[PDB]
Each structure stands twice: as C-alpha cells, then as structure tokens.
Symmetry: D2
Subunit: 320 residues, 4 copies
Amino acid sequence: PIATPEVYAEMLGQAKQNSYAFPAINCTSSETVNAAIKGFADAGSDGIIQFSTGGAEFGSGLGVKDMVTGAVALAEFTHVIAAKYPVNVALHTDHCPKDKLDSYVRPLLAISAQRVSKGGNPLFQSHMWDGSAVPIDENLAIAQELLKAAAAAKIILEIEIGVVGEKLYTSPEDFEKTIEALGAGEHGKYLLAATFGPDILAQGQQVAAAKLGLPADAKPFDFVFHGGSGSLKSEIEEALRYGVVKMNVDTDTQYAFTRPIAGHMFTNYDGVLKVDGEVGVKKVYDPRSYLKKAEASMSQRVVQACNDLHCAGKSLTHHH
Amino acid sequence: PIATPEVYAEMLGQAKQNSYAFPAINCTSSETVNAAIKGFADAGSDGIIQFSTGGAEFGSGLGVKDMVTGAVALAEFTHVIAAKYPVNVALHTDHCPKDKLDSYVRPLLAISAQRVSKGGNPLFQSHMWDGSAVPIDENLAIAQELLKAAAAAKIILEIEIGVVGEKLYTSPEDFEKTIEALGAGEHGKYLLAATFGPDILAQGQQVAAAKLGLPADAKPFDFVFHGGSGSLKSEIEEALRYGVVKMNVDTDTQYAFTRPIAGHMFTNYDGVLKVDGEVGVKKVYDPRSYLKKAEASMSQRVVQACNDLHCAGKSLTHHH
Amino acid sequence: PIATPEVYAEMLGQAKQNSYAFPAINCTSSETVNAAIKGFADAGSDGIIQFSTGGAEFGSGLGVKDMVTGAVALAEFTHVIAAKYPVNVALHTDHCPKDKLDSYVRPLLAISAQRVSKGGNPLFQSHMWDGSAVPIDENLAIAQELLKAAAAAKIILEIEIGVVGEKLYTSPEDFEKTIEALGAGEHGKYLLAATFGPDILAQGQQVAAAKLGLPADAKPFDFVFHGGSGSLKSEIEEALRYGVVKMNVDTDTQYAFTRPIAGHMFTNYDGVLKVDGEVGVKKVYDPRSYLKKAEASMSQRVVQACNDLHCAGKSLTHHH
Amino acid sequence: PIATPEVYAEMLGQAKQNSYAFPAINCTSSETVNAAIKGFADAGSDGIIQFSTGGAEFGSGLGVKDMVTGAVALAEFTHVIAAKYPVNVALHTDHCPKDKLDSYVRPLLAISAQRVSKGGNPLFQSHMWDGSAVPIDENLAIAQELLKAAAAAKIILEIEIGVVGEKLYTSPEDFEKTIEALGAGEHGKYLLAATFGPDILAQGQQVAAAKLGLPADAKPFDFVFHGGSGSLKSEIEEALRYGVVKMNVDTDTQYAFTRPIAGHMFTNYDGVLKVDGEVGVKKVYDPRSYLKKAEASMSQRVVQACNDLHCAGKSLTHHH
Ligand SMILES: O=C(O)c1ccc2cccc(O)c2n1
Ligand SMILES: O=C(O)c1ccc2cccc(O)c2n1
Ligand SMILES: O=C(O)c1ccc2cccc(O)c2n1
Ligand SMILES: O=C(O)c1ccc2cccc(O)c2n1
Ligand SMILES: [Zn+2]
Ligand SMILES: [Zn+2]
Ligand SMILES: [Zn+2]
Ligand SMILES: [Zn+2]
Ligand SMILES: [Zn+2]
Ligand SMILES: [Zn+2]
Ligand SMILES: [Zn+2]
Ligand SMILES: [Zn+2]
C-alpha cells in the first residue's frame, strides 16, 4: 500500500534506530513507478518514490508542462498500483527552490491539507524544500512556516541546509540554527539533506546533540544522502552510521531502465525501423516489448539499492 | 476534460450526424496517454483513449499483472491530465472475450456503478464486449445483460457481431438479431464493430432500417472500424459514409512512438551505452530525453488520424 | 583471367553486335574487387572493374594518397585473383579530368607502354579521359593524342563529349567532330560516354552513320552509360538498343556492400563494442565476419547487373 | 619499401641486440595492409605484416577460397604500397600446420625459390611452420627440411616447439633438440614461438647457451611472442629481455579497425539504411567513408604497438 503518514514516520524511525536507509527513486512515468515498486517488493522492502520538478513537468505531458498536474497525476496512478503490493510506498517531491514553491510544493501541500480536513490522508507523505540558494536564515524561516503547514497536513518536510559548491558544505552554526529554528521533531518530523566524499554528518549530530543536552553519541538529525550515484559501497556504510535514512537515486536507475531499450533497438533494428521498403515488425516496435525489459531491469537495480542500504527484508508489513 | 457520459453521447451523435469519426487510440502508459491527448488537442478534436486487456496488464506492472488494476490506474492518471485540456477525452476498454469478462469488464462496470450510485460519473465511458468467438445468440444474450448494466452506469457498450475469418463477416440475420435484441439505442447506446476490405456496413444499415420501419437511407447502427491500420484513405472515406463513428488505432501510433526512440539510441549509441570503459552520457540515457520525442511523434500521428477521420477542428468545446 | 586486349575488344564487339552490355563496377579494395569478380562468375559473365580517382587514392592508403600507386596496387591484386576465375575481367580507370591526366592516366599509360615494349600486355585495358569540362575541340585534341598512345599500348580509350548540365548533352556537331577527329575504330577503339532520361544516342548513331556513308541503322559508336543508378529497367533496354556496351555502376554496389555491415553492427552491438565493462566478442569484431557478408551481398547485386544488361551467361570463355 | 632478406635479417639482429621487437600485424585486405604500414611509418618503425591461413583464404575471395592465391594477391598489393613508404615492411605467413604445408607454405616457398633463381628476392621474407600438434622429433625433422628450403630462397623460418595446453609449454630437452637439429642460425636464421603468463624463455636461452658452449647470459634464440593480446605492458618488458624479436598482433588491431565502423553505422543509421521509404545517404554508405576511419584507427593501435615494443623511432632507413 501507499505509506500512511503514521507508517512513513515509523519507517524512518525504524531505519534510523537500526542504521539502515530507504532508496528514494526518481520516477517520471507509469513504467518507472511500476519498476520502482516491483523493486521494493522483490527486496521485501518499503521504499520511497519521488518526483523532481522536471519529472513532474515531464509527467504532465508536453501539452501541459505543469509540475502540479504531473505530480498529482503520477501520485494518483501510484496510489492505485501500490495498493496491490505488500510493501509500503511513500511518495515524495524532490528539490523545489524558492521560485517554484508557489507552483509546486505549496499547491501540493494545499491539496493534502484539503484531503486531511475531510479526514483523509495526504496525497504525498513528504516534500523537499531546497533553500540552499538563499541565506541560511531565510532558508530556515521558509522551512519553519513550511514545516508547520506540512506537519498539519501529516507531511514530513525535507530541507537542504548550507551552501552548494558538486558538494554540500554545512557549518556547525548551520546545524545549530536548524535545531534552534525547527527543533528535533517535536514540532513535526523533518529530513536534512547531506552529501559525501561524511564526518560532516557526524559533526552535525554531535553539534545537535550538544545543543539538545543529549549524550555525545545521539543522532537527532534524520539525514538524506544526495548525489550518491554509484557511490563507494563503504561510503554508504559510513553514511548509514551517521543517521542517513533516505538515499536519493536517479542516475543509476535511469541507466538500468534505458540499457535494455538500447539493446532492443539494436538487435531489432530492422523490426523497429521500416528498412529497404519493408514494413517493420509490429511485435518489436510495440512499446510494451522493450518497456517491459526496461521495467524489469530498473527493478533489479532498485533491489540492489535496497540491499546496499540494508532495508531489504525489513518492510514494516513483515510479509516474509 | 474527461468526456462526461452526456458529452460522449453527444460526440458520437454529432459524428454520426455529420459523417465523421473519432480515433480511439490504444494507450499503455502515462507517456502514451499524454501523446494521445496532446494529439487530440493539437487537432482541436475530441478523442477516445482505449486500453486493451494486454495494455491494462502492462499498465499494472510486471509485479501485479492485473487488468483491472492497470485500467483503473491509467484511467485515474488520465482523469487528472485530461482536466487540463480544452478537448473532451473518452476512456474505453478494447476487446474483452467471454473468459475475461469476470476479470476485466464486469469489475470495471461495478466500479462505475458504485461511482454513479454516489452521484458521480463512471470511470470509463465505454467498454467493449467481444463475443465474436461465441454463437450469435449467446453473444447477444451476454450483450443484452451487459447493455443494461452499462446503461445504468451511464456507459456505452461496444460489441462485435459475426464471425472472425483477418476480417469480420456479419450476415443480414446477424444485423437483424442485433436490432431485435438490443434495439436502436432507446435501451442504451451501443457501438457495433466492423472491418473493411465495406458495403457490408451499408447492407447492415439497410437491413436495420427495414427492420425498424425506417427510410432506406437511415443509419441506425453506430459502427466501429477495427483493423484499419494504414488503411486506404478512401476506404476510410467510405467507412465514414456508412456510419463509422470510431476508428481503432494502435499499430500506427506504436510505430510513431517507437521510431524516434530507435533513432535516439542509434545516434546516441555511445551515450546510452557505457562503451570502451566510458560511463555513458546521463543526458541521453535519461528516459525523458527519448520519451519526449516518442510522445511528440505519437501526437503527430494522432493529429493525422483526426484529419483523416474529419473530427479535427470539431471538438464539442468549440475552443477555436 | 584478366582480359587480354584482344579478348576485351572481342567482348565489346560481341556486346555491341548482340545488343548487350557489361557492368563496369567501381571498386576500391581487395574485398570489392573480390565481390565484383565473384559476381561476374556467378552470372557466367565477363565484366569490367574500374577505379575512380578517389577510389585509387583510397586504395593507396591514407599514408600515401597517390592515385597511380592505388590503381597499380589494386590492379596487381586483381591480376592474381582474376587468373583463378573462368570469366574475363577487364580493368579500367574512371573519370580523369585535364588537371589529373599527368598524375593518373598518363603515368598509367606509360607503365602499360613499358610492359607492351617488353612483349607484355597492358596493366589496364581501358582508361577514361573526361574532357567534358573543356571546349569540344580541346577535348578531342587531347583525345586524339591519348587515343594514339592508348592504341599503341593496346588500350581502349573512353571519352566524354558534350557539356554537363546531372545529365550530358551532346549535339549532332559534337558527334560529327568526334567521328572526324577519331574515326570509327580504325585508328584505335574508343568508347563514348552518354547519359539517359536516350534518343540522343540514336541521333548520335545516325549522325555518325551519315558522316561515314553508312546505312541509316548503323551504330558506329560504342556508348558508355553513365549515371544509371537504379535506372528504369526499360531505359536500360532502350540504352542497349542504341549501342551502349558498358554501364557504370557504383552507388548500387556501394549500398549492397555496406548494407549487411550495418546489419552486423546492430545485431552484434554488444560484440563489436566493449559494453558495460565487457570485452566484446572477437568473432564478431573480426573484420572478416562482416566483410564476407558485404562481399557476398555486393556479388549478388553484380549478378543482377549482369542479368539486367544481358551479359549474364555470355562469357567469352563459354564455361557453361 | 618491402624488406629485402638482408634488411629483414638486419632488422631482427638489431632488435635482438638492443632488446626490442617488431609487431607482426595480421592483415586480411588492402585496407588492413594500408593501416598496418601507415602505423609503422607514423611510428618511424619497420614492421611485419602477416597473413594467417584464414586471412589468406579470406583475401582470395569467397569465389576462390585458396590460401596461396590470397597470400600472393595480398603480397603483390603490399609490394606496390610499401615501395612508397620510408620504412621497411616484411611479409610473413602465420600458423601453418602439417596438413596445410602442401597447400600454403610449400607452394609459397616454391614461388620464392623461382624468383630467387631468376636473381630476384622472395615474395615473402618469413614463413611459419607450426608443428606443435606433432611429436617434437617429427616437428624438427620437418623444420630442418623447411629451413634448408627457406634459407635457399632467402627466407627466414618461424617454428613452434612444444605442446599446446591457451599456453605453450616447452621443455629444456625441446630447446636442446631444437639447437641440435637446427643450429643457431649458421644454417639459416629461424624464429622460435613462445607464450607468456616467461622465465621459460630465460631457461630456453640458458639451455641453448650451455649446449653451444656460450656464456650463461647469451641469447641464441630469436623468440616470437604469440597470444599476447592486451598483455601486461610489463610482461612485454620481460618478454623483450629474453630475446623476443617479434610479437604477433591480431585481436587488438581487429577491435581498433572495427570500432569506428560500428560507430559510423550507429550515428549514420538512417544514411546507411533506407528507412521509412527514404533512399539512404550515398556519402555515408560509400564504403570509403567508414573504412578510412577504420584504417586510421587501426594505424593508431599499430603505432601504440611499436611504442610498447620499443621499435618506434628505430627504422633501419633512419628517416628521422
Ligand atoms: O541528485 C541530487 O539531488 C544532487 C546531486 C548533487 C548535489 C550536490 C549538493 C547538494 C545536493 O542536493 C545535490 N543533489
Ligand atoms: O486491432 C483490432 O482490434 C482488430 C484487428 C483485426 C480484426 C479482424 C476482425 C475483427 C476485429 O475486431 C479485428 N480487430
Ligand atoms: O557516376 C558517374 O560517372 C556519373 C554520374 C552523373 C553524370 C552526369 C553527366 C555525365 C557523367 O559522366 C555523369 N557520370
Ligand atoms: O594468436 C596466436 O597466434 C596464438 C594464441 C594462443 C596461442 C597459445 C599457444 C601457442 C600459440 O602459438 C598461440 N598462438
Ligand atoms: Zn540533491
Ligand atoms: Zn519481520
Ligand atoms: Zn478489433
Ligand atoms: Zn465550433
Ligand atoms: Zn560519369
Ligand atoms: Zn557459350
Ligand atoms: Zn600462435
Ligand atoms: Zn637513426
């Protein structure tokens, strides 16, 4: 099923408590959503599906090019599919900068608040506010008002703190301001972006622990691993140790999805093309023929991600 | 928007009255649904989107393979998208034989009846019952009970009468039995499948007209043109003359969709593949890169279909 | 074997006498020479192999780029191969304009004159002088001195008369000047270029016949059909009627040669490329694997040419 | 130029004396011969071109399939080309087992003996007798009679001693029998095959040195490195130390030759194929278009080979 806000919070809490993480797979279509969920299920894992601003726009079609429409349409598709699987699937929106809040995250929040007001659950279970391009205080000011709105709609907020230089530098004062402005979850759960290539996360936890009068080994922050494509399956290990509960994946699953399509076109070149006055071969230019292969291949890469992140076999539905 | 049952009936009535038809495009995904709707809109046309049993199964993903799930999920996606366009889009299910009624058309009907009972509109606006493999009397017996259920859920029924030998032969008695069992629309609108390669349709109308005590030039039947891929844009003309209001399209739009994907893989062979120890090129193995081209190309072929069928420029929203 | 000057003259005389023609296949390599000869042999036909200035330069290799070297090297290769076949193969050089006579046709002539002076036969059996870019009188002046040199080395000269506008226009006076300057073969055999798209050849023969005091149906000229790629196998018929004894072929055999190579690369994409850290498949990146297919395919197209030109089955060796 | 027997012996002596080696490039065509020679020349190096039994058969064309014809035809081509370069090119035949001596090496030897008897030089400068499949004594018996014939035609003999298990094991007694039967060059120079993956060569030299009453560091054998594709450019170093004067290369140059052809077909897919009723693009299905790229790429790999083997910059023509 789709993760209810309650099981989503439980997923993240359990991951944090046991030093594992969920892959958060960028999806852009019915096929990629299907590959991602099947991958979670094959790994006996819960998981996260996320739509970027570009993915949402793509999802809405060339005739619309509206992020909200694309995200809503893909979310509604995903709700139907996920109900048929015995793992929990959370829906998320990726990087939304200041100039796109009004045309992406805010209208999506409003849709979920409307649903919650009628006794429903939100359409998405988390949204990312990416304020990295603005000064920290403005970043956290926006974050605070978004966090209140999100919490009230039963939605977790992801944020990104510090400066982008690609890698994300975050100072000890940035970590402190974040705890100060947002608290430690008691005003609504939130996730904090981070990159690697690592002890910065460790320092972030210690800084926050000190601020909160907590033992020096406490991990107040739930971290989100960005930019980890093909990363050292040892950096991943270390990332997990410092409280990463979510690792974003796109590049790796894109290659996995496209790879068999490429192979299909080459081996079936004279079926997918009308060559030398011939009429091609319907069975191989049928989009389902290569897109099933794309799906299965992406699902396999998602299974690998669940194993690398150690969430495989740990779905909260305990379907074993 | 999605066609309400009322505007769908109006669409078909207008087409019949003015000797034009709508293409009914097989779709299997978010991308293909997007291409189809954009095509209707670019042609200023209303249109029909249909899911085959195989397309629905594909739509549900390899991890589910459930026709109802796939059709529902794609329908929900399509409802969101279609609301953003100023043309009317009807949703349809294609060929459902006897052995699949219980796992496709019947559960879908029940979903729509539930929606209608709550004062809503049906999820789909038409369903096809393909009884061509059974004797005509059994075919029409099933058709009658399905027609009653469909009409009560504000859904139009498509049926296929006669024997498949590919082409569809339908005798004058088959046409007569059909009018006798089903009436002429007063017990619920229905569509009748037909093939070409043509005067058979003409004879069908005359036979039905005689039965109904109507003038010899009346056209009681609304016909559905099956198997018309790449057909003589002159057979199409003649088809229109005999009351075809819906022409099914799949092969042509499949080739249009796949063609640029093929071209993308070839020209970007060393970007979509990691070659000679290189790491490929993310920008071209990003599925959106070639799938946007696929979408645009399918939309173009759909525009052509609207022009060939003369529904281009005639959307009932009169957005000109 | 290679055509001796005597059998080459006999070949052309027989073709002219019986209204058939030989294809003259542009070749650029050992593989293309092999495909051409095998094609002649499979059709039980004599034939002509010709090297363009560009083909000769290509034949000499990127490190040399010398037309004479390339033509000589390919000719020597061809002498060895042709001795193993029971058909006669003539060697020819294609289009040589004024500015290239000193670096192509003239040095080649000198090589053959040297061989003849030692009691041998010439290396090539014909050479083309293409003077179409200069005024007719200069064209024929050069032609006359070249014809004397060629005849003395037992070589037939091909020339091109008239203006290029692509198609070749040749006036009745041009035909007359040609007979006047060169005679009708008694001062050395020569071939006259022509194009189609046809009665111009007919007029040329009548004009020459009148000049020579011959019956109105005589055909003094041996014509060479240039620019006939994919031509109407009815234009070919008419061409034959007017004294075409040689039809130049390049485009058609290029496509035939390349076509299976293309197919080989696509179907073996992950063998001819090292993909995803794999090492490729030696058996399919072995140049012989696809080049054998290229050869066989070009030979087939050459067989077709022999049949279209009616020289198939008529080799002067009468190996049946 | 082509290496005269005298400069070929000088090449090998110099290489041995200075611990370098020549690549011996398998070639199968005019294009591959051109790429190899251009590669030697670009590296300022002498080099060896060799024809395998399969390469020779391929060279003769599908219509002939005769090893002698193919080798002779390619050799004659190569004589013309090599005269235009300021490096020395030796011609060689690769692996000829017992059952093919009568249809490959022996007739080729006879051709060269005929040339030498008329005061000419041999057509080939070395031939390989591969007796590895027969018992050592039979191997060396054949080798002795072949060596006498070769020496008398001014040809160097390559032999292969020991058992194939792929790698070549050669015992100390095998090395001793070889020196005993053949001497150390005073009865005609010969080359001895060897593989790596290395001290076996060292032991071979010591064994031969002992037999000949030579200092323990003498290197009586001229070794030929077989099976060294992509080998450790450190094994190559060690190979050189033990008296390897010739390293056979095929796989590496095959991949280099084919690689750009593959790329050409993919990027020009709709030019090399007639697609969607189009007629293709002559400029890219012209075999010269991709074969020039193949040639240049193979030449580059040959330059690399000359550098790895340290013969680059050491051509005996001292054209600097
Ligand atoms: O793919 C990403 O989301 C990604 C990639 C690189 C990054 C560098 C710094 C901060 C981020 O959020 C980054 N994010
Ligand atoms: O594509 C089709 O739906 C199709 C194709 C061929 C047919 C022949 C007879 C009856 C049909 O419904 C047919 N339908
Ligand atoms: O391929 C050719 O040789 C060719 C092609 C087109 C021509 C047009 C006029 C005259 C020629 O020799 C021509 N030749
Ligand atoms: O490519 C070759 O010539 C080759 C390859 C592998 C071998 C193994 C043992 C002996 C040889 O001559 C070998 N030769
Ligand atoms: Zn990021
Ligand atoms: Zn459990
Ligand atoms: Zn049908
Ligand atoms: Zn209007
Ligand atoms: Zn021409
Ligand atoms: Zn005969
Ligand atoms: Zn070997
Ligand atoms: Zn020097």
